[PDB]
């Protein structure tokens, strides 16, 4: 009957990892911000016998995580996953998400005596330089890393947020490195753009705060507006939760890097497959040039070799097509 904590587990990957624990007889522990969002998450899934919260207001601060990691020393896994317009780019991400990396970690080392094994959710934008993405003669595996430095990282942003991410999990390898008796393994998992469903449909809202909303600014589209530019790797939220729970059961996954990436995409690819599969929405959003986007994809991005990741996780992705339906689906009927 093992014990499992997970932080923000109100977030977009976590309700998914959740509920796939929650199915595997797992006993969770999600901290949350508040009794709101506490109470509301033991009501989507009606109160189970295996599911409970403790409140962690902020989850960046010092000792934020001893009081749970005190009350509950029966936990073995520590599945770390918590999380809006930027002045500073150095004070309010990249301090935050280097100092908060060291504090969770911390309260760990003092207090998480029978943790185990600990999962960080970190990005793709921490194994990938910009430069490098861009190359289509390049290859990318779980071993680069973005080599885009401090002084960079507060030029705008977006290379703001890509850095805190790198920033972020060399704070994590740069802890358990550093720092002698470390009890626990850890390992990292590193998503491209994130889509799929939300776990439950009573969460849609107008603007979905998640990267699904890059599908979604396509459903608000007029058929005459341009399609806009976006490309990149991704991966289906249900997959990356999947590989959370796999990152901990399969010993291989001690110490590894886990690259998540299903495959790739331009706006072009998003629209292609709503104007075919949503007869109601063809016609209302636009059309622009279809199949445009396997000669750019072609063109202009490096190819990912994430083969030692899938090796480690040994289940079928979602695709595309299936990612963009259940979103879009989902997104639809939550409108009436």
Avoid: C
Wanted: proline letters at 3%; hydrophobic letters at 40%.
């Amino acid at each position: 009957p093992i014990t499992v904590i997970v932080s923000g587990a109100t977030g977009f990957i976590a309700q998914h990892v959740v509920k796939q624990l929650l199915a595997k007889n797992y006993q969770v522990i999600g901290t949350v911000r508040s009794t709101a969002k506490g109470d509301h998450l033991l009501k989507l899934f009606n109160n189970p016998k295996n599911l409970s919260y403790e409140i962690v207001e902020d989850v960046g601060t010092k000792g934020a995580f001893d009081k749970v990691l005190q009350k509950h020393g029966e936990a073995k896994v520590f599945l770390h996953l918590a999380s809006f317009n930027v002045t500073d780019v150095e004070k309010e991400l990249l301090l935050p998400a280097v100092d908060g990396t060291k504090n969770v970690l911390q309260a760990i080392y003092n207090f998480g005596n029978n943790i185990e094994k600990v999962v960080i959710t970190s990005s793709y934008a921490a194994i990938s330089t910009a430069s490098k993405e861009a190359d289509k003669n390049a290859i990318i595996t779980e071993k680069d890393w973005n080599e885009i430095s401090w002084q960079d990282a507060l030029l705008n942003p977006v290379n703001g947020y890509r850095g805190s991410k790198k920033f972020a999990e060399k704070a994590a390898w740069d802890f358990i490195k550093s720092n002698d008796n470390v009890k626990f393994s850890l390992s990292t998992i590193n998503p491209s753009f994130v889509f799929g469903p939300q776990s439950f449909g009573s969460e849609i809202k107008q603007s979905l705060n998640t990267s699904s909303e890059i599908i979604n600014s396509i459903l608000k589209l007029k058929p005459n507006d341009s399609i806009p530019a976006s490309k990149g790797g991704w991966v289906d939220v249900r997959d990356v939760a999947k590989a959370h729970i796999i990152a901990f059961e399969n010993e291989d996954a001690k110490n590894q890097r886990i690259l998540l990436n299903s495959g790739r995409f331009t706006s072009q690819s998003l629209v292609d497959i709503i104007n075919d599969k949503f007869p109601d929405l063809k016609g209302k959003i636009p059309v622009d040039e279809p199949g445009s986007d396997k000669s750019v994809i072609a063109e202009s991005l490096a190819t990912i070799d994430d083969t030692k990741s899938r090796e480690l996780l040994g289940f079928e992705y979602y695709n595309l097509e299936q990612s963009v339906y259940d979103t879009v689906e989902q997104i639809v009927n939550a409108h009436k």
